[PDB]
Ligand binder design. Sequence first.
Ligand SMILES: O=c1ccn([C@H]2C[C@H](O)[C@@H](COP(=O)(O)NP(=O)(O)OP(=O)(O)O)O2)c(=O)[nH]1
Ligand SMILES: O=c1ccn([C@H]2C[C@H](O)[C@@H](COP(=O)(O)NP(=O)(O)OP(=O)(O)O)O2)c(=O)[nH]1
Ligand SMILES: O=c1ccn([C@H]2C[C@H](O)[C@@H](COP(=O)(O)NP(=O)(O)OP(=O)(O)O)O2)c(=O)[nH]1
Ligand SMILES: [Ca+2]
Ligand SMILES: [Ca+2]
Ligand SMILES: [Ca+2]
Ligand SMILES: [Ca+2]
Lengths: 129, 129, 129
Amino acid sequence: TMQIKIKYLDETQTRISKIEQGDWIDLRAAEDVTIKKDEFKLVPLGVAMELPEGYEAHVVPRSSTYKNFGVIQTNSMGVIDESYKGDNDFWFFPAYALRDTEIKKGDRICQFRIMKKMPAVELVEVEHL
Amino acid sequence: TMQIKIKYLDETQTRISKIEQGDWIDLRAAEDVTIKKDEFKLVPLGVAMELPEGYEAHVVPRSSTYKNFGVIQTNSMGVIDESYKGDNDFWFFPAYALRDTEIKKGDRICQFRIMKKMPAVELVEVEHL
Amino acid sequence: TMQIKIKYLDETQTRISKIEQGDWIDLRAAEDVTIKKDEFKLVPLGVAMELPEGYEAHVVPRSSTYKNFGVIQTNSMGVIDESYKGDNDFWFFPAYALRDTEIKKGDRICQFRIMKKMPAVELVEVEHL
Ligand SMILES: O=c1ccn([C@H]2C[C@H](O)[C@@H](COP(=O)(O)NP(=O)(O)OP(=O)(O)O)O2)c(=O)[nH]1
Ligand SMILES: O=c1ccn([C@H]2C[C@H](O)[C@@H](COP(=O)(O)NP(=O)(O)OP(=O)(O)O)O2)c(=O)[nH]1
Ligand SMILES: O=c1ccn([C@H]2C[C@H](O)[C@@H](COP(=O)(O)NP(=O)(O)OP(=O)(O)O)O2)c(=O)[nH]1
Ligand SMILES: [Ca+2]
Ligand SMILES: [Ca+2]
Ligand SMILES: [Ca+2]
Ligand SMILES: [Ca+2]
């Protein structure tokens, strides 16, 4: 199987290694985050990762995230590149609150999977298609 | 040649037609739903599916879902796993209404495709990246 | 390497051809767009493409789009099929503004990659799963 190296922000972050069979993986808030209605905050997720060469990760909310927390993800789907593999390259979930809300440290807030990056392409300009 | 088994909620749901291979497939509201501006409702899609093994489905709006139906999708992209294949595992579109709206039975509110699940990965903690 | 043919709206659009290595590609507003709070506009991107056969494109916001512009993409992830390849099939970004905003001509507003279309599938209706 493919290795992903993961570094946690600190010792209190919930470790997320288990036997994986192709399911998306839940990520968790690194700290309590309060968000007022119609405000935006980056929810830190407390993990940095070196993804497999030639891969990227996609991040979206969980199914019940809206019900529980009343937030939407402002970028729709977050794309994490194999190059965001630095020692300070921590992941976040960009949240817009549709109601006053609180997200607690340790809460599952979004989920990711990996995906092979697109193949090499060359764009060629033409005057007409 | 890959098969998806599909169960409809009832006889009144408009069946999905012979497909054009590879194109996303539109899904229809299973009943009339009224949603007031700033309200959230699960819009039933009136279908349950057994996806091929090792696949998942992704569900997103149409480009015109906002113009036609007044809603955004609260989970950004719905991910339907192979394991959501039970006889009562019906699909929904989680709608937040940005204006008052009357969605109708049969309205093509979103679209789906299948995709292979990500490979088996092993997360390994490291102190530093 | 696969080719994508690209046609620009006019001579003033910024050409986006360069060496590609699987990264998503930024697309840019074709003209100034003003969007008031709680309004929606299709932001023109000034490009039409013939994608490789058997492939589709996916379009999402850039990571900083919400901070810089206050817009969310109403369809979450836009899907451009291979058949959207006509001389007047210009791409757009469906934007809903959460605050009064201005996007300037040439601003990077979203990004795309390609992905192979789903395989041929046969839907088989069953009475029970
Ligand atoms: O939802 C997200 C999106 C991105 N990220 C990470 C990956 C991304 O590289 C980083 C932000 O760095 P940049 O501001 O450089 N954005 P990006 O890497 O997309 O830059 P570019 O526009 O050059 O591709 O945040 C998240 O943690 N969550
Ligand atoms: O937009 C969606 C998303 C999910 N679904 C389906 C699939 C999902 O399995 C189901 C909701 O079941 P759960 O509350 O068990 N959520 P999920 O399967 O995502 O759970 P987990 O967090 O364990 O992966 O609704 C939709 O119909 N539309
Ligand atoms: O974000 C997007 C989405 C689609 N598009 C273009 C390409 C796509 O083929 C076309 C239609 O997309 P949708 O299928 O999401 N909308 P709809 O079902 O309303 O259009 P059609 O009736 O043409 O399928 O719009 C964009 O330019 N940006
Ligand atoms: Ca999950
Ligand atoms: Ca409002
Ligand atoms: Ca369509
Ligand atoms: Ca990018």
